[PDB]
Ligand binder design. Structure first.
Ligand code: HEM
Ligand code: HSM
Length: 184
């Protein structure tokens, strides 16, 4: 199965205003499907208001040199560090080019955040059933290494950073303006 990981614990008392601001770059990622070996770059701009998350997502396929843009929207859990979103497909100007498919959703858990670093987990689902998951280390700076608090969080769940794919070595292309201008 594409069963999502157990023991994914939301950070206690995440600072929402700090986390749900600016642009986050994935610096390391671990797709829990060992055969998912396509190289990707990822960045996003998550925002929150009134218990609803609205985020802009950017992916770049290094293997194919194709980029794609999505937006996701959903309720933030009472714990304040986990949300489940439905997503559509937009172009680089933010115009919807494909509507959200009702059967798909994803659940983001913010496991840890420290300084300019964060660690999230994403469980993808179809009709409310797991179809795969991934962990990502995030940083405000593409070239930066994670704060040690991130490693501690990985270590609590028997993961080590060396298992992760490192992105700075990849030939990434980013659309930073798409994310900078999110909700502007
Ligand atoms: C951090 C490293 C990440 C990597 C390496 C990654 C990789 C991928 C890959 C390989 C796909 C499939 C693309 C294809 O079908 O051609 C994908 C799709 C997608 N991912 Fe990610 N992802 C990451 C993070 C995230 C995060 C954090 C979110 C949500 C907050 C997210 C949401 C999505 C969405 C909405 C799609 C489109 C699915 C569809 O079109 O059916 N991803 N990503
Ligand atoms: N194993 C989950 C893959 C993925 C891609 N994008 C988001 N999640």
């Amino acid at each position: 199965p594409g069963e999502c990981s157990v023991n994914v614990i939301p950070k206690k008392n995440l600072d929402k205003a700090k986390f749900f601001s600016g642009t986050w770059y994935e610096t390391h990622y671990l797709d829990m499907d060992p055969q998912a070996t396509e190289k990707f770059c990822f960045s996003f701009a998550p925002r929150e208001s009134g218990g609803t998350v609205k985020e802009a997502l950017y992916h770049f396929n290094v293997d194919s040199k194709v980029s794609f843009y999505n937006t996701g929207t959903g309720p933030l859990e009472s714990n304040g560090a986990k949300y489940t979103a439905k997503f559509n497909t937009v172009d680089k100007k933010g115009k919807e080019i494909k509507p959200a498919d009702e059967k798909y959703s994803y659940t983001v858990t913010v496991i840890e955040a420290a300084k300019q670093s964060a660690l999230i987990h994403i469980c993808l689902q179809e009709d409310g059933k797991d179809i795969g998951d991934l962990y990502s280390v995030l940083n405000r700076n593409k070239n930066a290494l994670p704060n040690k608090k991130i490693k501690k969080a990985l270590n609590k769940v028997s993961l080590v950073l060396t298992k992760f794919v490192v992105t700075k070595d990849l030939d990434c292309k980013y659309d930073d303006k798409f994310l900078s201008s999110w909700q502007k």
